[PDB]
Paper text:
The 20S proteasome core particle (CP) is the key non-lysosomal protease of eukaryotic cells. Its seven different α and seven different β subunits assemble into four heptameric rings that are stacked on each other to form a hollow cylinder. Only three out of the seven different β subunits, namely β1, β2 and β5, bear N-terminal proteolytic active centres, and before CP maturation these are protected by propeptides. In the last stage of CP biogenesis, the prosegments are autocatalytically removed through nucleophilic attack by the active site residue Thr1 on the preceding peptide bond involving Gly(-1)45.
Yeast strains carrying the single mutations β1-T1A or β2-T1A, or both, are viable, even though one or two of the three distinct catalytic β subunits are disabled and carry remnants of their N-terminal propeptides. These results indicate that the β1 and β2 proteolytic activities are not essential for cell survival. In subunit β1, we found that Gly(-1) indeed forms a sharp turn, which relaxes on prosegment cleavage. Regarding the β2 propeptide, Thr(-2) occupies the S1 pocket but is less deeply anchored compared with Leu(-2) in β1, which might be due to the rather large β2-S1 pocket created by Gly45. Thr(-2) positions Gly(-1)O via hydrogen bonding (∼2.8 Å) in a perfect trajectory for the nucleophilic attack by Thr1Oγ.
Residue numbers in the entry:
A (entry chain b), H (entry chain N): -16 to 196
B (entry chain V): -11 to 222
C (entry chain K): 1 to 212
D (entry chain L): 1 to 222
E (entry chain X), I (entry chain J): 1 to 195
F (entry chain M): 2 to 233
G (entry chain W): 1 to 204
The structure:
């Protein structure tokens, strides 16, 4: 029962309670997220961007504490920029390792549920999930945030490997639509980020569309 | 680290920030509270970080003034070092990393706004070190009263005069409906290519009415025991 | 509060302050802390204002019913015991009362009974009750003799309250004096500390700690 | 865990004259930092030339006033329409309050009217029933702000006759109804300035032998 | 519960201090001297937490004696009291503060005046005509407000002090086993053996 | 004791000929938005509407009491549908009595309630009561988040008593519907679907079901990137 | 065990026509016990005056600290510190102890020697500056002082009239507070003369 | 989270954390449930029957406290048997009302999340859900128990009105399969009870079948 | 705290009880008699929670006096002690128990023997040659183990008692303002006025 994750948060701090997911597919990987930020039952920001760049084609989805995830993501971006200056482009695994190192070594003072997703040319699309404990788990797709509980059933039944871009976008849209519908901590617009060899594409979807799916 | 002071001043407030065509505007009320008591009936909540970057503050009054001055000091030295006009993202980054380091014990909640060579910017910073981006933002005890107005009347492509009207209307909603906020409306307009104009007491809708009686005492009313000339000179 | 009452050659002196507080807030400077039960019986009040005020006026009703039923004025011992038995029934419930039942009867003579809210009931010649009781004791004990005159005894009671009113932050306002004889109680006026302190300082030459 | 009390703010003020008495009180009702109502009266005519107000927790305040109004009604039935004197009303209220000694009405009660000699009277009560007649009393949220001002202006405290070396005090005298209303209006405008829970409107109830008159004044709404 | 008193009169300062040392339900000693001589014309009495009291008193004593040797000169009672206050003012914000209250009675040889200072464990200094620490004050202050005069002699001060001790012996709950009295004047410090 | 399944804000205001009241159709189970078909406006006769927020099980208890009150009033009452019909003031005072009695037994009905209606003489009735038994009246009234966000907006239309005759039903309903949208933006335990009720002295009771929040502004979200420095 | 209300005390400051006034009570107690009736809470460094309420040990410590700092200021600057500057110095020094603060409520008062403008200011315990045209209050009877000042105060009072207003504000506030009173002192400050008066008040 | 549902239980008592659901369809209504009972992380009973008869064609699904739900169901069965002796067959609404009355009036001392489902000839299939608070909610279908959180997304997307018997059985089987897969408090066999005009039919489904769906 | 002692000798029982009544930091009275006569040859001393002590003692006293009138006969010390114990044994499991400890000293006229019973607030009865309640026992028991003999006279018992009081006055923290001593024997109950 996951009131406990919220329970870990510092009193009166902004909460990211979220509906975040990353899905690998034929051409690469797609990250998806809602846009709601809460302070108790008040929505502090209804148009938040929870998908954040740590490198050109390595992004992450943030959940848990807004402050903690931002501080971590900023440090990771710094590490990978310094890595690139010396050793060239880092692997998605390398990025996940830097995230893990920060999350694990500071597991008591932090509340950060992060999904790392990136595109290599050799390794194609990859997804690593990092829960509260600071453990790393490489998966075909990953879901996280307060709203993810409501779509474990749906996502497990509907996920297939080697999907197309349009299919994966529909999979993420339908999933987050349900997570938003049931989770009060999730809502607003559905942001998405597409990572392929072609480049980086940002997508957005509004309530009027996804609510009536 | 000390887990709060109750004696420490922590004013109720309504501060807002609104983006427009060629810049950004911020506004605030002018009430400072001590518990249920109004300590200052006309304080200034709009602070200067740099000439064209300004900062509205709510929460622990000492922490907002102290953190805005410290970062403002370091921004000035940075501006002199780099021979460049300071950027809003630099103030944003320096503020959040300071606030995060202290884990929320520095109770500063800020709306940062300004113009720089990159353009016009509007951010909010929370005590624990999280930051948000927006076209319209509100903090303080009267943030909900203000945000209600902002959500009702805000649109894309606001003019300068429309943004000032929307901002002051949002502050007024806090003044009337929130007990933590009151008195006057301060405004600061930061337009691109122009000097920032600080409009102290832009509105004064809460003037004290004439008293029914004068309480000037007849001279000699107070009983005195001793008089003596005090030496202030050397 | 500060209240006292002592027994001496010429009967009983009773003296009280008039302050009432709610924490550090001075709520009143003109509270009547002596209750006039009957022409021969007095009661002092210290502690919870409502508790004292309510139950001592109730005590007066019980004493009236006694003299109707028995065709005779109630004894000081019996009156004090009605109150002490009442508060004992409420023991643990959180009543706060420090009272003194002072009076004269034929069979007893002049008599004083200390009665508090945790059930204690004591007969005695001298008692000081309240937050400033220790301050009153200091002056009273060091100047007390059985052979005091009515004039000197009245002053010592007044001066002992004044002493407490000065030092104790939760005592002050004004001094109410009473004198109890074989013929009943006699009121000896309300004395504001505002004027009384300076009058006493000048005439007595005391209170040298204060800037004159 | 459930907390049965709340703070509805507001402040009240009673002053007694020679042949009259006033009982004032602001009309603002609040919880925490929100305004519930800008005009919610809490000073009531209870009959027999008695005006009453029970400031603090409004639910307990309303319950008490309601019960006292009913007490007046049954006093008439049981005692051949006899007029309830202000001193008798005061004692009756003490028993109402002390009746709930172990689950109190969280209110500061003030009543005002004329005594049996036709002279102005004000009585004030604590939450559990201790009462006292006074010339002057402020109660509620801004009581600590207003009360010392009244000590100075009504009872002339700390004021001495000029030139008498602080020996002769300023003599006590009754104030006119015009002078009393001036002090009330100045008390409430000052309290509105410095206390957040006080404002919106002021309602004064004046009690003379002729009856009960009302006066209303605007206050700052911030 | 530990009694320490002080009375400044015309030409001297008189300090009275209880003799009892109690731990649990046992009076371990009934002849304890709760004072240290800081300098020939300065005396400090003390009371508070066990161990802390003597450790603090002796630490101050050592520092004042060090100053006297270094400068071949006696520090004034005002100077000593200010030094003591600062040490307690430092102490209160330490990891483990000294829980000690003191009275400093001294005779200033330059001014030819007696001086009495009352300092609590927080570092709260006040010069007074008469002073006391602990529950003693609740009785002695009001008593002295009445009976004290500024122009009294040393003998009158001792009778005034007897009046305090009698009252304390009558109304205090604990048996404090009497007091050791010491007088500070122009001729230095001496103890009254029969009290 | 605590509320489990809960209902959020109830908002309301007066206008020239009557009163308007509204509330969304959500029954929250903590952070879970569990029930979506919950009606929280309950009419009593053809002249009163009781809007209830807080614990839904306690709301359903109050429903049954009001239902039973209509039945009881009809007993031995030939003028039950005329002079001796239930007034809003009667219905409110009953509820207010119950709420204060329950709090006094340390066993409160957890709710916040607003009774809106029109009296027999044409006067507008609008009054509030909650778990503590606290009551107040005002030209605009709201519960929960509504108190913080709706009231400010509704008071811009009717700031004092004298503004009531100047406010038409069209203007008033527009303000209410706007307020419901703002609550959907900013209240984490609110829904898009809601009910609205108008009680007019001339046209009577109009009960509107299955309303939706519309004309929402979300387009500006696409321009917002990152949380500070990020450009992409 | 609330540091700000163990010893008790009050300070108030007001402005007038080309003058300022600052006043304080004389009580120092230990909760209910009154200990000293000579404990002044107003100090001065050159022409700048500082009043301090709160925990008495910190009042003493801060006086000694600002005497220390203003003396070094004068030696290096070769001039006396001004009220506006001193206010900033107090704010800095208090906030330096942010997470272990002095339990005090200081109040600055004085006239700028260059411009001649009357100046007053107040602080919380961690150094938040509260500037005001009219008046500043501090101590255990701050609520009472706020009430008295707001009603009695009017702008541009002459020194002789200002004395009466501040004195009546302090006295009547102190009499409604158990931990304040036991005497009072009022400073009237003109451009180049300063009068100090001890008030007669009730000693309970 | 689910914790404050399980934080309600008395120390050491048997827990009925569950995956229960009732679904109306063309011919009537079907009740479904898992068979797991836990005491902390130990499975006290792996073959429990959470579907219980209060009347011929009025059944209920139990979740929360085993003791509390059993005590309630026994009392309801007693009330409906006494109702039948005097007034004939009770409606499903009447049964739900008796459940509510017990759950609401004893809301502080009880932890019982009950779904009531029955078949009338006039009213056909009906489903009433009664959560912890003691409120009543009539619905086309209902889900409850610790494991229901994971299938809100799936059930909302897949439920249709006027389904056939075979479709409804598949809907319940697939749903509870997912709830069991993700919820540790749920497991064992999937019991079902079919309520129609034809009569009462009991169904069972074993892990080997439903796990590999 | 309160001091109540008891010594049974050859032909009598001697009870000693402290005179001080203290509340807070004030000794309100220094002449209090902490005992009640239950019957002509039975005396009960008491100590414990304020109010409870006297309320309990008088309640017992009334019950024993009622028995004496009804039967025109004096109950034996053993019978009285058993009655008292049962009342305390009931009390301890009540809503609000009597927090009172007692000593019952009596002379049995049928046996011609003195008897001393010690009962605590729980209802724990023991017959003893010497007894004490509270912190007093921690000193007096070991002292009496040494000096007590069974065949002592009343005068020897009083000297033995003086030895106890002296030790308590020396080593006890609180000033209990001396003791009131009473003797119970074949001729009834009498008080020693000079102790
Ligand atoms: C000296 C002065 C102090 O001990 C005397 O002992 C006097 C005795 C006289 C009055 C008989 N004692 C008090 O003044 C007494 C102190 C006290 C307070 C509370 C409990 C025990 C002792 N003061 C009071 O009782 C005040 C009297 C009012 C001011 C007239 N009353 C209160 O504080 C009340 C009621 C207290 C209470 C007791 C039991 C149950 C419920 C309430 N409380 C309030 O008024 C609360 N509040 C305080 C701030 O102002 C708004 C109201
Ligand atoms: Cl964020
Ligand atoms: Cl089971
Ligand atoms: Mg005093
Ligand atoms: Mg399982």
């Amino acid at each position: 029962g996951i009131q406990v994750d919220i329970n870990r948060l510092k009193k009166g701090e902004v909460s990211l309670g979220a509906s975040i997911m990353a899905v690998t597919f034929k051409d690469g990987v797609i990250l998806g997220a809602d846009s709601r930020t809460t302070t108790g039952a008040y929505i502090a920001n209804r148009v938040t961007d929870k998908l954040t760049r740590v490198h050109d084609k390595i992004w992450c989805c943030r959940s848990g504490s807004a402050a903690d995830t931002q501080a971590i993501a900023d440090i990771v971006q710094y590490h990978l920029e310094l890595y690139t200056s010396q050793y060239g482009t880092p692997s998605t695994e390398t990025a996940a390792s830097v995230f893990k190192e920060l999350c694990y070594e500071n597991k008591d003072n932090l509340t950060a549920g992060i999904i790392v997703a990136g595109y290599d040319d050799k390794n194609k699309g990859e997804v690593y999930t990092i829960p509260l404990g600071g453990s790393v788990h490489k998966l075909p797709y990953a879901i996280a945030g307060s709203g993810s509980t409501f779509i474990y059933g749906y996502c497990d039944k509907n996920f297939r490997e080697n999907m197309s871009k349009e299919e994966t976008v529909d999979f993420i849209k339908h999933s987050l639509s349900q997570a938003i519908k049931w989770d009060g901590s999730s809502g607003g617009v559905i942001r998405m980020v597409v990572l392929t060899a072609a480049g980086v594409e940002r997508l957005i979807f509004y309530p009027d569309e996804y609510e009536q799916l | 680290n000390s887990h709060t002071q109750p004696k420490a001043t922590s004013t109720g407030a309504t501060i807002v920030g609104v983006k427009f065509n060629n810049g950004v505007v911020i506004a605030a009320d002018t009430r400072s509270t001590q518990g249920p008591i109004v300590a200052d009936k006309n304080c200034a909540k709009l602070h200067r970080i740099s000439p064209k970057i300004w900062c509205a503050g709510a929460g622990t009054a000492a922490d907002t003034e102290a953190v805005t001055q410290l970062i403002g000091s370091n921004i000035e030295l940075h501006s002199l070092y780099t021979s460049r006009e300071p950027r809003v993202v630099s103030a944003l980054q320096m503020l959040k990393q300071h606030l995060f380091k202290y884990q929320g014990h520095i109770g500063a909640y800020l709306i940062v706004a300004g113009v720089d060579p990159t353009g016009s910017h509007l951010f909010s910073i929370h005590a624990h070190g999280s930051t948000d981006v927006g076209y319209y933002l509100s903090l303080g005890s009267g943030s909900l009263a203000a945000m209600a107005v902002l959500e009702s009347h805000w649109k894309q492509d606001l003019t300068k005069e429309e943004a000032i009207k929307l901002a002051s209307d949002a502050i007024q909603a806090g003044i009337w409906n929130d007990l933590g906020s009151g008195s006057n409306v301060d405004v600061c307009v930061m337009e691109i290519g122009k000097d920032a104009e600080y409009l102290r007491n832009y509105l004064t809708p809460n003037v004290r009415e004439e008293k029914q009686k004068s309480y000037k005492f007849p001279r000699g009313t107070t009983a005195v025991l001793k008089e003596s000339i005090v030496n202030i000179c050397d | 509060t500060t209240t006292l009452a002592f027994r001496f050659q010429g009967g009983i002196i009773v003296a009280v302050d008039s302050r009432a507080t709610a924490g550090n807030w001075v709520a009143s400077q003109t509270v009547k802390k002596v209750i006039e039960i009957n022409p021969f019986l007095l009661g002092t009040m210290a502690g919870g204002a409502a508790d004292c005020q309510f139950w001592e006026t109730w005590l007066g009703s019980q004493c009236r019913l006694h003299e109707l039923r028995e065709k005779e004025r109630i004894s000081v011992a019996a009156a004090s015991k009605i109150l002490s038995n009442l508060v004992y029934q409420y023991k643990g419930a959180g009543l706060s009362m420090g009272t003194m039942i002072c009076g004269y009867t034929r069979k007893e003579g002049p008599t004083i009974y200390y009665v508090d809210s945790d059930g204690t009931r004591l007969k005695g010649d001298i008692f000081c009750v309240g937050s400033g009781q220790t301050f009153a004791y200091g002056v009273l004990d060091s100047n007390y003799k059985w052979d005091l005159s009515v004039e000197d005894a009245l002053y010592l009671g007044k001066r002992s309250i004044l002493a407490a009113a000065h030092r104790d932050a939760y005592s002050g306002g004004s001094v109410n004096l009473y004198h109890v004889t074989e013929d009943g109680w006699i009121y000896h006026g309300n004395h504001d500390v505002g004027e009384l302190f300076w009058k006493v300082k000048e005439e007595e030459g005391s209170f040298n700690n204060v800037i004159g | 865990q459930f907390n049965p009390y709340g703070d509805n703010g507001g402040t009240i003020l009673g002053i007694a004259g020679e042949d009259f008495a006033v009982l004032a009180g602001d009309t603002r009702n609040i919880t925490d930092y929100s305004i519930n109502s800008r005009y919610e009266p809490k000073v009531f005519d209870c009959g027999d030339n008695i005006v009453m107000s029970a400031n603090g927790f409004a639910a307990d305040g309303d319950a008490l006033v309601k019960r006292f109004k009913n007490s007046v009604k049954w006093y008439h039935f049981d005692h051949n329409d006899k007029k309830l004197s202000i001193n008798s009303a005061a004692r009756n209220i003490q028993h109402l309050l002390y009746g709930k000694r172990f689950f109190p009405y969280y209110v500061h009660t003030i009543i005002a009217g004329l005594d049996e000699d036709g002279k102005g009277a004000v009585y004030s009560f604590d939450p559990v029933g201790s009462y006292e007649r006074e010339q002057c009393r402020a109660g509620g949220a801004a009581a600590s702000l207003i009360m010392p001002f009244l000590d100075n202006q009504v009872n002339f405290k700390n004021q001495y006759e000029p030139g008498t070396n602080g020996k002769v005090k300023k003599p006590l005298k009754y104030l006119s109804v015009e002078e009393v209303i001036k002090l009330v209006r100045d008390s409430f405008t000052s309290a509105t300035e410095r206390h957040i829970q006080v404002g919106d409107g002021l309602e004064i109830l004046i009690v003379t032998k002729d009856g009960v008159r009302k006066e209303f004044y605007e206050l700052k709404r911030d | 519960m530990d009694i320490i008193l002080g009375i400044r009169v015309q030409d001297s300062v008189i300090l009275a201090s209880s003799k009892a040392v109690t731990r649990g339900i046992s009076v371990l000693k009934d002849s304890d001297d709760k004072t240290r001589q800081l300098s020939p014309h300065t005396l400090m009495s003390f009371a508070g937490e066990a161990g802390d009291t003597v450790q603090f008193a002796e630490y101050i004593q050592a520092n004042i004696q060090l100053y006297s040797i270094r400068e071949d000169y006696e520090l004034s009672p005002q100077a000593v009291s200010s030094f003591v206050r600062q040490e307690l003012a430092k102490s209160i914000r330490s990891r483990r503060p000294y829980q000690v209250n003191v009275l400093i009675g001294g005779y200033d040889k330059k001014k030819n005046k007696p001086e009495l200072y009352q300092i609590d464990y927080l570092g709260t200094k006040v010069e007074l005509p008469y002073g006391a620490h602990g529950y003693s004050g609740f009785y002695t202050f009001s008593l002295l407000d009445h009976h004290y005069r500024p122009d009294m002699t040393t003998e009158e001060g001792l009778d005034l002090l007897k009046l305090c001790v009698q009252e304390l012996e009558k109304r205090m709950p604990m048996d404090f086993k009497g007091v050791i009295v010491k007088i500070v004047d122009k001729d230095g410090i001496r103890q009254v053996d029969d009290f | 004791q605590q509320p489990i399944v809960t209902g959020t804000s109830v908002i309301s205001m007066k206008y020239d000929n009557g009163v308007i009241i509204a509330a969304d159709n959500l029954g929250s189970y903590g952070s879970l938005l569990r029930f979506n078909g919950v009606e929280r406006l309950i009419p009593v006769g053809d002249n009163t509407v009781v809007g209830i927020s807080g614990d839904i099980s306690d709301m359903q208890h109050i429903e049954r009491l009001l239902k039973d009150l209509v039945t009881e009033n009809a007993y031995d009452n030939p003028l039950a549908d005329a002079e001796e019909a239930l007034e809003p003031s009667y219905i409110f005072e009953y509820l207010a009595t119950v709420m204060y009695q329950r709090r006094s037994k340390m066993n409160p009905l957890w709710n916040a309630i607003i009774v809106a209606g029109v009296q027999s003489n044409g006067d507008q009735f609008l009054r509030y009561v909650n778990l503590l038994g606290v009551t107040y009246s005002s030209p605009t009234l709201a519960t929960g988040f509504g108190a913080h966000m709706a009231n400010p907006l509704l008071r811009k239309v009717v700031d004092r008593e004298s503004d009531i005759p100047k406010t038409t039903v069209q203007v008033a309903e527009e303000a209410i519907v706007n307020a419901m949208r703002v609550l959907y933006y900013r209240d984490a335990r609110s829904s898009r679907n809601f009910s609205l009720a108008i009680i007019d002295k001339n046209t009577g009771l109009t009960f509107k079901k299955n309303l939706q929040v519309e004309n929402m502004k979300w387009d500006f979200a696409k321009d917002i990137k990152g949380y500070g420095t990020q450009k992409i | 065990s609330d540091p700000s209300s163990i010893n008790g005390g009050i300070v108030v400051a007001m402005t007038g026509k080309d003058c300022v006034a600052i006043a304080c009570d004389l009580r120092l107690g230990s909760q209910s016990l009154g200990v000293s009736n000579k404990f002044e809470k107003i100090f001065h460094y050159g022409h700048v005056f500082l009043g301090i309420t709160g925990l008495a040990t910190d009042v003493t410590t801060l006086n000694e600290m600002f005497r220390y700092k203003t003396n070094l200021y004068k030696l290096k600057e070769e001039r006396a510190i001004e009220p506006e500057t001193f206010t900033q110095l107090v704010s800095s020094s208090l906030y330096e102890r942010r997470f272990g603060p002095y339990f005090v409520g200081p109040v600055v008062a004085g006239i700028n020697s260059k411009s001649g403008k009357p100046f007053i200011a107040g602080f919380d315990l961690i150094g938040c500056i509260d500037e005001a045209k009219d008046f500043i209050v501090s101590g255990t009877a701050s609520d009472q002082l706020f009430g008295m000042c707001e009603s009695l105060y009017e702008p541009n009072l002459e020194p002789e009239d200002l004395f009466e207003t501040i004195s009546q504000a302090l006295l009547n506030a102190a009499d409604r507070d158990a931990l304040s009173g036991w005497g009072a002192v009022v400073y009237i400050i003109k451009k180049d003369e300063v009068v100090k008066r001890y008030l007669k008040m009730r000693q309970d």
